[PDB]
RNA sequence: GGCCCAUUCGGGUCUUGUAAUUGGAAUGAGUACAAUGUAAAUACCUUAACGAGGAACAAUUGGAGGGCAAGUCUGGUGCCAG
């Protein structure tokens, strides 16, 4: 049972990296830019209503 | 015959095992702390709930009750000695502020991973159950061991362990003999 | 105050010669 | 209660009614008429499957449990042996 | 620090046995022979005390309960050795046969000491220890404090602060490279930089009323304990 | 006023030196002004401890620039020789750095001293 | 990179990368074969 | 200064040794309101002494 | 410009790892009323139900709504004004407290909701990582709180 | 019967005399399967060793008496003791006040009796 | 990635005064008021335009939390060309030079700092930028440097103190416009480490409501920073 | 290519997949020489040698979905549906 839950948990972490950004040690070395690209009009801001 | 005996359960099933939040909580907890099944969390939750039930009883009592100062300061001393309750927060409302992951952090598995003796919680567990971890002079093989501060200090590899200075394991000497032969 | 008040109570709840000491002494002379 | 307070019931297998039915694994294939040993009231029961209909034969003891409408009962053992156990070839039916 | 305990013949200094500590972190730091006995006690940096019998050329037992490297060990005719663990700041006695432990801790804080007065330096570590008696012992800390202990009381019965004095203040010509002297003087910060001498050595003659302390101040100080064993003087 | 500011008092120096030895045993200690400098450059440090009695004190004021620019709390201790003894190293030490590790066994007591350092500043 | 690798366009540097060329070579062959 | 050889196996050891000292004396100049040459002089003789050892 | 709100960093899938003791609860108007019906006093009802120190919090809309109820519900208004009940300011035009609360719990994942209104419980249930408090039977009940 | 555990806990801090602690590894019951002995277990055990040494032979445990002294003493453990510190006394209900209360005949009963105690 | 010889593809951002450099990598980029030099060792683009050589400076989201907010996708920013900006907590020109690049020569950036030791670099950076004015003073006491500040369209707060809401408040009443901009960077560890990250942010949004800021949006700065968000508001004195 | 949300259309996110190959270590159940233990003996404790890649030294239970034939049946508005 232990290894199954281990594989499930590392599986579960990944789906959270997909849904949302997470901190992964921050910048490591020289800044190489946005790897996935910058999108002009997509705002991920949370608007106070 | 002679008098029978009292024994008690260390855990209790939750009210509703089936909230998705609940299941995701055991998933996070077993993954982070390498727990075998849900019985360990049921045990820890039961024990913590008992402590909190006592603590709220004392918060109910008026300050300077003999019962209150007695029972609560005893609780604080014990929770400090197990290492869960820090020195600077010796008061019952902070006893009311604990969370189970502190108790899981006090599990010997967590220190074996944390101190650097093991590269993972599961590696810590296999090392412990395999008698490679000694608390001072004594070999311990239970991951659920609750480590004290003074016991936290003295975690090491056992003298009899191949990693602590004993002879190489069966595999090493077997391969060495085959290489020589 | 209450801690002491417990202490006198135990003292109350709890020519001068001890039978056991006399038994230990012969054991020591035996030693 | 279906069994008058009991959880299970004995019966004697009288006839496999749908044995002639054409469509394989049919619900009508699936029904067997069983006479309760308690009171002589003839009733019908469900089996696990057309393979498990094949273990059951007439005049053998069968254990019944609550489950084509009109049929409320399920056969769980035959001659003191579990049908599921026979189906997994984990046991042999005693004659 | 070679993680070995080599026994030498007194007459010729020839090696007759070598006893490894069998620990990577087992550097020997203090050795104390039981008085008028063949028992040897070895305090190591592995946070353990190892017990040997020299006539036996064998290791006997390992003792545990220090919370930091064990710098000094002292023993008398009895098997009640005393040890100090440096930064753990705990003076400590053993019974080898029972294996049980005494824990002694100083517990002084400059805030109260200044108040009851109304320079005191917090103790950093206990580096030296010597047994004046089977029931009494003394220790020296890195705040210049030498403390008298008894088995009856966990806390010190008597303490003598800044025994060896305060270290010389750093020179103002080296404190900073600024030309103006007044600029350099501010870097001295008055007297908040000043620190005390450490008690590098502390030895008490067995079952006597005098003991000697040592440091790099340049003088050996001899102290005398009171008849009642409640205080001492220089 | 002094370049040596803030300077921890006798008590606070003790708990800080408790951090350095225990961090040293756990391989979470980079000691010295030079290797203190990189840890700031990589942003991997909780805080940098320095000695106020250094001769000259000048040789460590490049570090606070990096710390305060990087919002890293810092403290000075009166003695370098005492600091070096805490590093587990046979020589005086003028600067030291505790590195960022939420997976460390001593997280709590570091963050304990963290809060007192921030109050001091 | 060296001055020799610095070029006028983004494009022609992509050619100087041998790893990019082999990656492009292999897939075109697969795409033509299925086509 | 490794592109124009400002500080220039044993030769490299002096360069790194001098570089560490140069990184030092830069500090004493920058963070002192009126820097002096007293520490620079004793810093250079230390470089000098190292020179004859190697 | 198109806007896609982030999912809160305090939420692990559907488990909220931020709400920890002491808790903060938003009180709806019905909850004070139903609390009085069951003779369940406000603060202990969370203490015994949740076994943690609880910081009750009421909005201006809820304070406004309790006031407009009328003389029939005086004790409900008073009880909202107990000192241990803190107040939450609002910067929006409407006094409709239901829309005010859903925004806050949508907005921020550190609150428990205390309500029994039917329209509200379904809406908040859809919001992930939000515990729900309600009064039923003889004492309060907490549905979506892993720590219990 | 009068003794209740935590009053001695205060005494130990307020005694100002050391408490004779034992070694860290010496206190595991059995390889971790049984937690650290509670403080009580270390006194009742030493009563046996102190009681064994003089008599010069061991004490065997009767098959019957074994059935109320071993399990429950270590089932209270897994139910109460966590890391070798007892938590059962906390849940249990006892009249703590009576044990400390000056119930002995030498108690304040009239104004003079308490006036004597000031003197 | 962005290696010296390669070429990049620079275009405007949604927000005025901000640009994006496309290519194999996407870089948040803005122009240089002082071409030919970098303030904190940041990397710079050169574009030949009719031919004059215009230069641009890269924004690192990890170093600058404002740049992290852009990557997070802040909906509306009051910092823009031709707007006065009053930036608090000016450790150095790591972000002030970037905030300057947005406002342009027409605007100015009012940089406020407390400690002297960073101020020397802030003053030196201010020389290269004729619009940046360093006001090295305690932001807890705006009255000390009311002498120095003409009015401001937006106030940005980089100050990491427990009482930052009070610093932002006192500055906002004195200097901010009605309907003016307010942008604040929050580190829950600095304010209250005892309670979770989130609840601190709830409390911080509260103060802005009592001293008359209507707050507009918050943005957590993951993956660039932990335990952080950028709350943006409008100062409604009415 | 993997994953997440969404009745609807679609939208959101990035180090991933192996049903691929390969290396050296650790040790438990077992196979067990001894002593100890004891009226003797069993058991307990301690302890030589051997003991893993399908680590075949081969734990289960329950549920949800598939898909395949020169295969079979039934009803149809062909190549469909059950």
Curated annotation (Swiss-Prot), chain D:
It comes from Saccharomyces cerevisiae (strain ATCC 204508 / S288c). The chain holds residues 41 to 144 of 145 of the full protein. Keywords: Cytoplasm, Hydroxylation, Isopeptide bond, Ribonucleoprotein, Ribosomal protein, Ubl conjugation. One of its GO terms (molecular function) is structural constituent of ribosome. Component of the small ribosomal subunit (SSU). Mature yeast ribosomes consist of a small (40S) and a large (60S) subunit. The 40S small subunit contains 1 molecule of ribosomal RNA (18S rRNA) and 33 different proteins (encoded by 57 genes). The large 60S subunit contains 3 rRNA molecules (25S, 5.8S and 5S rRNA) and 46 different proteins (encoded by 81 genes). The modification 3,4-dihydroxyproline is found at residue 24. It is found in: Cytoplasm. Hydroxylation at Pro-24 affects translation termination efficiency. The stereochemistry of the 3,4-dihydroxyproline has not yet been determined. Changing residue 24 to A: Lethal mutation. One of its GO terms (cellular component) is cytosol. This is Small ribosomal subunit protein uS12A. The lineage of its organism: Eukaryota, Fungi, Dikarya, Ascomycota, Saccharomycotina.
Curated annotation (Swiss-Prot), chain E:
One of its GO terms (cellular component) is nucleolus. The WD domains are required for nucleolar localization and U3 small nucleolar RNAs binding. The keyword Phosphoprotein applies. WD repeats lie at residues 23-62, 65-104, 121-159, 195-233. One of its GO terms (biological process) is endonucleolytic cleavage in ITS1 to separate SSU-rRNA from 5.8S rRNA and LSU-rRNA from tricistronic rRNA transcript (SSU-rRNA, 5.8S rRNA, LSU-rRNA). GO terms for molecular function: snoRNA binding; U3 snoRNA binding. It is found in: Nucleus, Nucleolus. This is Ribosomal RNA-processing protein 9. Its main location: nucleus. Keywords: Acetylation, Coiled coil, Nucleus, Phosphoprotein, Repeat, Ribonucleoprotein, Ribosome biogenesis, rRNA processing, WD repeat. It comes from Saccharomyces cerevisiae (strain ATCC 204508 / S288c). Interacts with UTP25. Component of the ribosomal small subunit (SSU) processome composed of at least 40 protein subunits and snoRNA U3. Belongs to the WD repeat RRP9 family. It comes from the Eukaryota. Involved in nucleolar processing of pre-18S ribosomal RNA. Required for efficient pre-rRNA cleavage at sites A0, A1 and A2, and biosynthesis of 18S rRNA. Present with 5130 molecules/cell in log phase SD medium. The chain holds residues 256 to 510 of 573 of the full protein.
UniProtKB/Swiss-Prot annotation, chain G:
Essential protein involved in pre-rRNA processing and 40S ribosomal subunit assembly. Required for the early cleavage steps of 35S rRNA at the A(0), A(1), and A(2) sites. It comes from the Eukaryota. It comes from Saccharomyces cerevisiae (strain ATCC 204508 / S288c) (Baker's yeast). Disulfide bonds: none annotated. The chain holds residues 164 to 198 of 217 of the full protein. Belongs to the FCF2 family. The lineage of its organism: Eukaryota, Fungi, Dikarya, Ascomycota, Saccharomycotina. This is rRNA-processing protein FCF2. It is found in: Nucleus, Nucleolus. Interacts with FAF1.
From Swiss-Prot, chain K:
It is found in: Nucleus, Nucleolus. It comes from the Eukaryota. It catalyses: L-glutaminyl-[histone H2A] + S-adenosyl-L-methionine = N(5)-methyl-L-glutaminyl-[histone H2A] + S-adenosyl-L-homocysteine + H(+); a ribonucleotide in rRNA + S-adenosyl-L-methionine = a 2'-O-methylribonucleotide in rRNA + S-adenosyl-L-homocysteine + H(+). Methylated by HMT1, forming asymmetric dimethylarginines (DMA) within a domain referred to as an RGG box, made up of repeated Gly-Gly dipeptides interspersed with Arg and aromatic residues. Residues 94-95, 113-114, 138-139, 158-161 are annotated as: S-adenosyl-L-methionine binding. GO terms for molecular function: histone H2AQ104 methyltransferase activity; O-methyltransferase activity; RNA binding; rRNA methyltransferase activity. Residues 196-228 are annotated as: Helical. Belongs to the methyltransferase superfamily. Fibrillarin family. Component of box C/D small nucleolar ribonucleoprotein (snoRNP) particles that contain SNU13, NOP1, SIK1/NOP56 and NOP58, plus a guide RNA. Interacts with snoRNA U3. Interacts with MPP10, NOP58, SIK1 and SOF1. Component of the ribosomal small subunit (SSU) processome composed of at least 40 protein subunits and snoRNA U3. This is rRNA 2'-O-methyltransferase fibrillarin.
């Amino acid at each position: 049972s232990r290894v199954k839950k281990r594989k499930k948990y590392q599986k579960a972490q990944k789906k959270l990296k997909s849904v949302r950004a997470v901190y992964s040690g921050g910048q490591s070395g020289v800044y190489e830019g946005e790897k996935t690209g910058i999108k002009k009009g997509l705002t991920r801001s949370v608007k106070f209503k | 015959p002679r008098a029978p005996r009292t024994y008690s359960k260390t855990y209790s099933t939750p009210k509703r095992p089936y909230e998705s939040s609940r299941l995701d909580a055991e998933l996070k907890l077993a993954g982070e702390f390498g727990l075998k099944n849900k019985k360990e969390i049921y045990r820890i939750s039961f024990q913590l709930s008992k402590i909190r039930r006592a603590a709220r009883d004392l918060l109910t009592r008026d300050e300077k009750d003999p019962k209150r100062l007695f029972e609560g300061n005893a609780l604080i001393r014990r929770l400090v000695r197990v290492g869960v309750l820090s020195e600077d927060k010796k008061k019952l409302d902070y006893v009311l502020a604990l969370k189970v992951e502190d108790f899981l952090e006090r599990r010997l598995q967590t220190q074996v991973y944390k101190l650097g003796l093991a590269k993972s919680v599961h590696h810590a567990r296999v090392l412990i159950t395999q008698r490679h971890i000694a608390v001072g002079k004594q070999i311990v093989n239970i991951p659920s061991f609750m480590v004290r501060l003074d016991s936290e200090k003295h975690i090491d590899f056992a003298p009899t362990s191949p990693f602590g200075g004993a002879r190489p394991g069966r595999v090493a000497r077997r391969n060495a003999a085959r290489k020589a032969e | 105050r209450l801690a002491k008040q417990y202490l006198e109570n135990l003292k109350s709840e709890a020519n001068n010669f001890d039978a056991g000491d006399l038994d230990k002494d012969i054991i020591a002379s035996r030693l | 209660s279906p069994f008058g307070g009991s959880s299970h019931a004995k019966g004697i297998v009288l006839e496999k009614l749908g044995i002639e039915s054409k469509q394989p694994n049919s619900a009508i294939r699936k029904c067997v008429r069983v006479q309760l040993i308690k009171n002589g009231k003839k009733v019908t029961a469900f089996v696990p499957n057309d393979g498990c209909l094949n273990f059951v034969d007439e005049n053998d003891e069968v254990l019944l449990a609550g489950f084509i409408p009109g049929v409320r009962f399920k056969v769980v053992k035959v001659s003191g042996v579990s049908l599921l156990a026979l189906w997994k070839e984990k046991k042999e039916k005693p004659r | 620090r070679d993680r070995k305990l080599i026994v030498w013949s007194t007459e010729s200094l020839s090696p007759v046995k070598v006893i490894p500590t069998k620990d990577r972190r087992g550097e020997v730091l203090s050795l104390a022979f039981r008085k008028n006995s063949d028992q040897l006690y070895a305090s190591c940096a592995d946070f353990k005390i190892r017990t040997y019998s020299i006539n036996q050329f064998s290791q006997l037992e390992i003792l545990y309960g220090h919370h930091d490297i064990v710098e000094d060990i002292s023993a008398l005719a009895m098997e009640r050795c005393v040890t100090v663990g440096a930064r753990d700041r705990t003076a400590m006695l053993w019974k080898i046969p029972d294996e049980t432990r005494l824990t002694f801790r100083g517990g002084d804080e400059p805030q109260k000491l200044l108040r009851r007065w109304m320079l005191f330096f917090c103790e950093g570590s206990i580096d030296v220890v010597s047994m004046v008696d089977d029931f009494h012992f003394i220790t020296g800390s890195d705040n210049g404090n030498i403390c008298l202990w008894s088995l009856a009381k966990k806390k010190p019965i008597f303490t003598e602060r800044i025994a060896h004095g305060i270290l010389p203040e750093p020179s103002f010509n080296d404190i900073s490279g600024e030309t103006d002297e007044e600029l350099r003087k501010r870097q001295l910060q008055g007297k908040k930089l000043l620190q005390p001498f450490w008690i590098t050595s502390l030895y008490a003659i067995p079952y006597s009323n005098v003991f000697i302390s040592g440091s790099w101040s340049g003088s050996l100080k001899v102290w005398k304990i009171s008849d009642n064993l409640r205080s001492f003087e220089l | 006023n002094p370049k040596a500011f803030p300077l921890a008092d006798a008590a606070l120096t003790q708990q800080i030196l408790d951090v350095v030895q225990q961090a040293a045993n756990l391989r979470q200690l980079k000691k010295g002004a030079n290797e203190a400098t990189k840890t700031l450059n990589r942003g991997i440090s909780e805080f940098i401890i320095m000695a106020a009695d250094c001769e000259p004190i000048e040789i460590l004021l490049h570090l606070p620039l990096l710390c305060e620019d990087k919002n890293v709390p810092y403290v000075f201790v009166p003695s370098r020789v005492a600091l070096g003894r805490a590093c587990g190293v046979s020589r005086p030490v003028i600067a030291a750095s505790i590195t960022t590790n939420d997976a460390s066994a001593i997280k709590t007591q570091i963050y304990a001293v963290k809060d007192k350092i921030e109050t001091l500043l | 990179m060296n001055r020799k690798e610095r070029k006028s366009t983004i494009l022609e540097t992509l050619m100087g990368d041998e790893a990019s060329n082999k990656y492009f070579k292999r897939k075109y062959n697969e795409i033509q074969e299925k086509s | 200064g490794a592109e124009k050889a400002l500080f220039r196996k044993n030769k490299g050891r002096i360069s790194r040794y001098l570089a560490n000292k140069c990184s030092m004396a830069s500090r004493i100049d920058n963070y002192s309101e009126e820097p002096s040459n007293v520490f620079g002089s004793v810093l250079k003789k230390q470089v000098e002494q190292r020179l004859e050892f190697y | 410009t198109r806007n896609i709100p982030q999912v809160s960093s305090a939420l692990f899938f559907q488990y909220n790892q931020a709400i920890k003791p002491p808790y903060q609860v938003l009180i709806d108007t019905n909850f004070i009323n139903f609390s009085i019906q069951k003779k369940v006093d406000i603060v202990r009802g969370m203490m015994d139900c949740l076994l943690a120190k609880c910081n009750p919090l009421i909005t201006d809309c809820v304070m406004a709504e309790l006031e407009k109820l009328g003389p029939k519900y005086r004790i409900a208004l008073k009880l909202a004004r107990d000192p241990r009940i803190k107040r939450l300011s609002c910067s929006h035009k409407g006094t409709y407290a239901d829309d005010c609360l859903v925004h806050r719990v949508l907005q921020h994942k550190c609150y428990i909701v205390a309500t029994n209104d039917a329209g509200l419980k379904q809406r908040i249930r859809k919001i992930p990582g939000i515990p729900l408090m309600s009064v039923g039977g003889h004492a309060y009940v907490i549905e979506k709180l892993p720590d219990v | 019967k009068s003794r209740m555990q935590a009053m001695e806990e205060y005494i130990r801090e307020s005694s100002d005399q050391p408490d004779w602690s034992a070694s860290i590894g010496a206190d595991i019951v059995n390889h971790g399967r049984g937690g650290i002995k509670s403080l009580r277990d270390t006194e009742k055990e030493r009563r046996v060793t102190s009681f064994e040494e003089d008599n010069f032979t061991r004490l065997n445990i009767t098959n019957k008496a074994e059935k109320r002294k071993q399990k429950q003493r270590e089932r209270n453990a897994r139910m109460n003791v966590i890391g070798g510190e007892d938590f059962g006394i906390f849940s249990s209900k006892r009249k703590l006040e009576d044990s400390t209360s000056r119930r002995g005949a030498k108690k304040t009963r009239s104004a003079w009796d308490r006036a004597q105690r000031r003197l | 990635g962005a290696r010296g010889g390669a070429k990049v593809v620079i275009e405007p951002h949604r927000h005025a005064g901000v640009y994006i450099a496309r290519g194999k990598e996407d870089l948040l980029v803005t122009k240089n008021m002082a071409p030919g030099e970098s303030v904190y060792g940041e990397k710079r683009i050169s574009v030949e335009e009719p031919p004059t050589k215009v230069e641009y400076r890269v924004w690192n989201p990890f170093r600058s939390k404002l740049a992290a907010g852009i990557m997070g996708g802040l909906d509306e920013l009051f910092i823009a060309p031709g707007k006065k900006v009053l930036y608090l907590g000016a450790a150095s020109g790591t972000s002030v030079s970037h905030v300057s690049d947005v406002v342009g020569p027409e605007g100015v950036v009012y940089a406020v700092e407390f400690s002297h030791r960073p101020g020397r670099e802030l003053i030196s950076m201010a020389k290269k930028r004729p619009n940046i004015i360093p006001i090295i003073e305690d932001a807890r006491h705006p009255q000390k440097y009311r002498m120095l500040i003409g009015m401001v369209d937006c106030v940005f707060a980089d100050v990491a103190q427990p009482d930052q809401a009070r610093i932002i408040a006192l500055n906002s009443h004195m200097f901010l416009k009605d309907q003016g901009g307010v942008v604040i960077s929050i580190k829950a560890n600095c304010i209250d480490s005892t309670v979770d990250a989130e609840t601190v942010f709830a409390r911080e949004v509260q103060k802005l409501r009592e001293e008359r800021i209507k707050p507009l949006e918050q943005l957590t700065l993951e993956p660039y920073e932990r335990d952080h968000c950028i709350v943006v508001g409008r100062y409604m004195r009415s």
